Amino acid sequence: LPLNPKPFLNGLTGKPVMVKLKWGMEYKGYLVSVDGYMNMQLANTEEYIDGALSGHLGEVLIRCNNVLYIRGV
Amino acid sequence: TYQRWQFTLPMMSTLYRLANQLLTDLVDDNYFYLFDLKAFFTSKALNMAIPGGPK
Amino acid sequence: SSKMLQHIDYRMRCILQDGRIFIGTFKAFDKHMNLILCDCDEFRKREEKRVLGLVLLRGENLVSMTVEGPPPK
Amino acid sequence: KAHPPELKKFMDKKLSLKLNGGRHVQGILRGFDPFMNLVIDECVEMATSGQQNNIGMVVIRGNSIIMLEALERV
Amino acid sequence: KLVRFLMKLSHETVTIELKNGTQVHGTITGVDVSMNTHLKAVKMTLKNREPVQLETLSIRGNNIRYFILPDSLPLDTLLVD
Amino acid sequence: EMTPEELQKREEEEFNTGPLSVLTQSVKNNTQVLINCRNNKKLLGRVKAFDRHCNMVLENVKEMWTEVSKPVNKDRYISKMFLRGDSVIVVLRNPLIA
Amino acid sequence: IGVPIKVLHEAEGHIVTCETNTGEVYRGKLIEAEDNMNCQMSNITVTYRDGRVAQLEQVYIRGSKIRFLILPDMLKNAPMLK
Amino acid sequence: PNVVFIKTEDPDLPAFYFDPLINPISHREPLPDDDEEFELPEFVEPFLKDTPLYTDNTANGIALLWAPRPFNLRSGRTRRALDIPLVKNWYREHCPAGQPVKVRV
Amino acid sequence: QTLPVTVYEMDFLADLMDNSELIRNVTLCGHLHHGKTCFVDCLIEQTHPEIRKRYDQDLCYTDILFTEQERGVGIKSTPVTVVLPDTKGKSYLFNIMDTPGHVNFSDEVTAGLRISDGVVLFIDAAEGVMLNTERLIKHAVQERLAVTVCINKIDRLILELKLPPTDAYYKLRHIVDEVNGLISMYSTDENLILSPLLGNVCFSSSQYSICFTLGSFAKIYADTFGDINYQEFAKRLWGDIYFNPKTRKFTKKAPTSSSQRSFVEFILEPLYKILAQVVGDVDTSLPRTLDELGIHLTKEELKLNIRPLLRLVCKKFFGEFTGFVDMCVQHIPSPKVGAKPKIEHTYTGGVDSDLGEAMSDCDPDGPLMCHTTKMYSTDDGVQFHAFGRVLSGTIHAGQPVKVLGENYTLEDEEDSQI
Amino acid sequence: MVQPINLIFRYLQNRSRIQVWLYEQVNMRIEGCIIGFDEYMNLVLDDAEEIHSKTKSRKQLGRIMLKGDNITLLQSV
Ligand SMILES: Nc1nc2c(ncn2[C@@H]2O[C@H](COP(=O)(O)OP(=O)(O)OP(=O)(O)O)[C@@H](O)[C@H]2O)c(=O)[nH]1
Ligand SMILES: [Mg+2]
């Protein structure tokens, strides 16, 4: 079952996931939109600095040159 | 004043076809061997006679 | 890009990303800002004049250029 | 427009690669792409600690490649 | 493209801060399509060093962090394609 | 790219259903935006317009960074800015506090 | 293609010295160079950042990690630079 | 070197034709394999494929390439009519066989 | 000193002699009248802007005696030193020796093969292999030089024989097969196979400035259309290989019965069409062809006669002779590499001597060893100038040297002077 | 010869225990099982886990989508 990453990001859009960036900080939120260039838009996310909560910020557009990876739960 | 001329190539082909009697069928200077101006000048300077040439 | 056609043969200073200094005669450039400089001197900060000669600089490590001296005869 | 790198001289030879964070690796070159991604057979690890770990057939992305070194004479 | 917007703003006394923290105060002269900025009347205050005077400056467009524009610039008539 | 057409209006459909549409509401509804950028700075203001490279124009901004002594956050006012798009971590529409 | 790449192809066969992003200076005879700055070099004297001098006989440098190159001085009479 | 030019006797033949005056060529390599497929881009064509191999003026243009002066030219100056010897080739080439003695003299 | 205008600086030629990897020592030879001196004329006109051929006569830049001008044949082998660019754009130093092709002056070629490393054999495409070509293949192989073959006068396949394209291909292939046979008869080395696939055979017309291998014409395709690997595309333009226009691939079987070979389809028929549209159709369809190939001519340039106009069109189309430089760089060794068989064959006492290992490195400093083979006269005829090559060391103006004759030994020491 | 995308295709055929290295991150490496790739070498992992070099605490990651601009070495076991 060959599952490419592009139908993975266009198929599971809407699930509450967490993105992790290059600096090591983590965004908990559900994915709103994603393009073919793999920029991402997620809503009402939460900020974990090294697993520790910092504060409330809002909904985030994330760019290609900032993200490390995208995992679930 | 009627000094210079330039034609097209079918014109030159037709004028070359009509003039086929006054022209030779030669293609190269392998003809005139020992029968050109320099050989005649050499036979002039050496006082000998080429067969067919002048005296 | 005629603003660099005006800068031809000038004795120009070049600042790198690490903070070093390339001073050379502006011989040639391209679209990727790759420099051909002749009779080049390197300045770093303790100050020292480090003679190089003919330098081909890659555009990925160049920040900003400025003009120091007129073209010699 | 992306021309492939001329790595025909280094085929099936033992080469050591340098990677970004002072990293070092060795092995046999087996091919390339026009993006300079390299396939390496018999890949031993050889980190900065000093202990050697063989892996096998691996792929190095070209963006972290610093330098090639041909240990065998090409 | 906004970079084509940037070449419509010649001869304006703006400041440029780069990715190294260096600040440049001067009148902008030329903008390339790759944001290669050609500047004159340069007051260049480098980070943790002394500010200097320069006559002609040429900044490569990749290392630009941001620009700072004065108060009297009517951009509402300048963002028209 | 498999779309070589000259009539290229996908980049504004990118601005409507894609990820960049976050900025277009701040173009249209004129909301406050917060920007975290690469040398750890926080820029709060109002963006006017932008492109696919996120080269943005901002107005009436306050930008903050901390200094180390021990880290204390300082702030400064700038009336208008142009911001290059590769010089950001994140762009943030500020939520409805109400 | 522009002028500095043609100057790079002209310096093949002579002795050049390159410094890359890891601060290492490699001096020796340039063998091959492409449109991009992938440089195949041989008979290389190697100066690290600390100061150790090494001898490496076949080096292939990726052009992405290169800071700059230093060329011979007799290339100021090359045809593309005149 | 011997000019090997062959005259055209039929206007309906093609200009480039294997004339049987020419001796026949007695008919009989590291070629790569088909599987390493080198594909050209779609708009790449051989040069000048719209123009034909020959036209009606080709063989005449080849025949005028070996014509004597002035029939190999296409531009020149006019000459005054008494300076054109029409018989100079005739006594310049050789003597034909079978002529009498006074003709040779 | 005064010098004619040259496209390169003379200081560049002065500084290029110091690197023995960028120098090639080439001898051009062949049978009588197959196009050597006109090829040298084309190279000289390539390097000099102010030297141009007359519209009616040949130039003959390297025939400097009056006997060669009155006889029309070559008598003395003449050297020339130029700087030429290749396909990739890199400049190279060429020392070219033009030797006569007449058999009774074969001694002028043997004096030329002693001071050089490579042989370029010119062969007439119409006549083919002749007597002196067959003798010079043997004489160039037994003297242990590299051999490349250029097939000159291909337009005699077009404008004299009026020959069909596949028949001209068969003529060229028969010439190359006879050359490979004459190589394999006298050689014991099997790595001397000559073929255009290896970049080893060139094609040329000296009268109209045509010179190409497969790689240069592939570079012409790459400059015209773009995004084509020319070094891979040039590997399939010879032999029984066919272009299939449906799949756009190169297959070894015939798609149709009218399918031509790749060399006929991509190279030889555009050459026929260029020559045909210049010669036969200058008046009607030549501007359409010159607009199609991307060549612009002045209105005064269109009013020329047929042969200078064909030379001008082929010179604007093909341009610089980069394929010849590619062949002479790829298949003729530098004097730094090929010094060892030269010292092994030409130096008495063997290469295993103490001085032989010093000369085998081509060291520009150290012991001076030069070998002069040719003597040239001045204008007055009162004194001669020696001509040779420098095997080792560096010779200086004003340096006292020792001249050793052909009767000198270490035992005698009589035939020597300072 | 071997090109790297055919070996990534062989990796997704073999579903091997692929350990991925990272750009500029000398300590933190990730074990995983590859499923698919793309033209810019973005890689999904079925059961990914994080292994440091000074801490070495194995934490669960699940099916991740690691980008192309971060990876250095795709090694096995
Ligand atoms: N048709 C045609 N004739 C040519 C070509 N190249 C040379 N010739 C002619 O052939 C004749 C002899 O050319 P040269 O170059 O003098 O012959 P050569 O090889 O120097 O003779 P050597 O003195 O033995 O060296 C001249 O009339 C040239 O114009 C060519 O490409 N095509
Ligand atoms: Mg000659």
UniProtKB/Swiss-Prot annotation, chain C:
Record note on modification: Methylated by PRMT5.
Compartments reported by the entry: Cytoplasm, Cytosol; Nucleus
Domain Sm: 1-71
Disease: Cerebrocostomandibular syndrome: A syndrome characterized by severe micrognathia, rib defects ranging from a few dorsal rib segments to complete absence of ossification, and intellectual disability.
Subunit annotation: Core component of the spliceosomal U1, U2, U4 and U5 small nuclear ribonucleoproteins (snRNPs), the building blocks of the spliceosome. Most spliceosomal snRNPs contain a common set of Sm proteins, SNRPB, SNRPD1, SNRPD2, SNRPD3, SNRPE, SNRPF and SNRPG that assemble in a heptameric protein ring on the Sm site of the small nuclear RNA to form the core snRNP. Component of the U1 snRNP. The U1 snRNP is composed of the U1 snRNA and the 7 core Sm proteins SNRPB, SNRPD1, SNRPD2, SNRPD3, SNRPE, SNRPF and SNRPG, and at least three U1 snRNP-specific proteins SNRNP70/U1-70K, SNRPA/U1-A and SNRPC/U1-C.
Family: Belongs to the snRNP SmB/SmN family.
Any further remark recorded for this protein: Patients with the autoimmune disease systemic lupus erythematosus (SLE) have autoantibodies directed against some of the individual snRNP polypeptides. The most common autoantigen is called Sm. B/b' bear Sm epitopes.
Protein name as annotated: Small nuclear ribonucleoprotein-associated proteins B and B'
Complete-protein stretch covered: 6 to 88 of 240
UniProtKB/Swiss-Prot annotation, chain F:
SUPFAM superfamilies: Sm-like ribonucleoproteins
Protein name: Small nuclear ribonucleoprotein Sm D2
The organism's place on the tree of life at top rank: Eukaryota
Cited InterPro entries: LSM_dom_sf (IPR010920), Sm (IPR047575), Sm_D2 (IPR027248), Sm_dom_euk/arc (IPR001163)
Domain spans labelled Sm: 20-97
Entry's family note: Belongs to the snRNP core protein family.
Keywords: Acetylation, Cytoplasm, Isopeptide bond, mRNA processing, mRNA splicing, Nucleus, Phosphoprotein, Ribonucleoprotein, Spliceosome, Ubl conjugation
Entry's localization field: Cytoplasm, Cytosol; Nucleus
A Gene Ontology BP annotation from the UniProt entry: RNA splicing
Basic and acidic residues biased stretches: 1-12
Pfam families in the cross-refs: LSM
SMART domains xref list: Sm
Leftover remarks: In the autoimmune disease systemic lupus erythematosus, antinuclear antibodies are developed with Sm specificity.
CDD domains: Sm_D2
Region of interest (Disordered), residue spans: 1-22
Subunit structure: Core component of the spliceosomal U1, U2, U4 and U5 small nuclear ribonucleoproteins (snRNPs), the building blocks of the spliceosome. Most spliceosomal snRNPs contain a common set of Sm proteins, SNRPB, SNRPD1, SNRPD2, SNRPD3, SNRPE, SNRPF and SNRPG that assemble in a heptameric protein ring on the Sm site of the small nuclear RNA to form the core snRNP. Component of the U1 snRNP. The U1 snRNP is composed of the U1 snRNA and the 7 core Sm proteins SNRPB, SNRPD1, SNRPD2, SNRPD3, SNRPE, SNRPF and SNRPG, and at least three U1 snRNP-specific proteins SNRNP70/U1-70K, SNRPA/U1-A and SNRPC/U1-C.
Gene that encodes it: SNRPD2
GO MF annotation, one: RNA binding
Phosphothreonine PTM sites in chain numbering: 3
Chief subcellular location: cytoplasm
UniProtKB/Swiss-Prot annotation, chain G:
Location of the Sm domain: 3-75
Keyword Disulfide bond: no
Keywords, alphabetical: Acetylation, Cytoplasm, Methylation, mRNA processing, mRNA splicing, Nucleus, Repeat, Ribonucleoprotein, RNA-binding, Spliceosome
BP terms from Gene Ontology: 7-methylguanosine cap hypermethylation; mRNA splicing, via spliceosome; protein methylation; RNA splicing; spliceosomal snRNP assembly; U2-type prespliceosome assembly
Subcellular location: Cytoplasm, Cytosol; Nucleus
GO MF term set: enzyme binding; histone pre-mRNA DCP binding; RNA binding; telomerase RNA binding; U7 snRNA binding
Coiled coil residues, start to end: none
Keyword Membrane attributed: no
GO CC terms, sorted: catalytic step 2 spliceosome; commitment complex; cytosol; methylosome; nuclear body; nucleoplasm; nucleus; pICln-Sm protein complex
PTM comment, free text: Methylated on arginine residues by PRMT5 and PRMT7; probable asymmetric dimethylation which is required for assembly and biogenesis of snRNPs.
Physiological role: Plays a role in pre-mRNA splicing as a core component of the spliceosomal U1, U2, U4 and U5 small nuclear ribonucleoproteins (snRNPs), the building blocks of the spliceosome. Component of both the pre-catalytic spliceosome B complex and activated spliceosome C complexes. As a component of the minor spliceosome, involved in the splicing of U12-type introns in pre-mRNAs. As part of the U7 snRNP it is involved in histone pre-mRNA 3'-end processing.
Entry's family note: Belongs to the snRNP core protein family.
The protein, known as: Small nuclear ribonucleoprotein Sm D3
Source organism: Homo sapiens
Curated annotation (Swiss-Prot), chain I:
Source organism, top-level taxon: Eukaryota
Residues involved in GTP binding: 30-37, 98-102, 152-155
Residue ranges occupied by any tr-type G domain in the UniProt entry: 21-303
Subcellular location: Nucleus
Reported disease: Mandibulofacial dysostosis with microcephaly: A rare syndrome characterized by progressive microcephaly, midface and malar hypoplasia, micrognathia, microtia, dysplastic ears, preauricular skin tags, significant developmental delay, and speech delay. Many patients have major sequelae, including choanal atresia that results in respiratory difficulties, conductive hearing loss, and cleft palate.
Functional summary from the UniProt entry: Required for pre-mRNA splicing as component of the spliceosome, including pre-catalytic, catalytic and post-catalytic spliceosomal complexes. Component of the U5 snRNP and the U4/U6-U5 tri-snRNP complex, a building block of the spliceosome. As a component of the minor spliceosome, involved in the splicing of U12-type introns in pre-mRNAs.
Family: Belongs to the TRAFAC class translation factor GTPase superfamily. Classic translation factor GTPase family. EF-G/EF-2 subfamily.
Protein name: 116 kDa U5 small nuclear ribonucleoprotein component
Part of the whole protein covered: 107 to 524 of 972
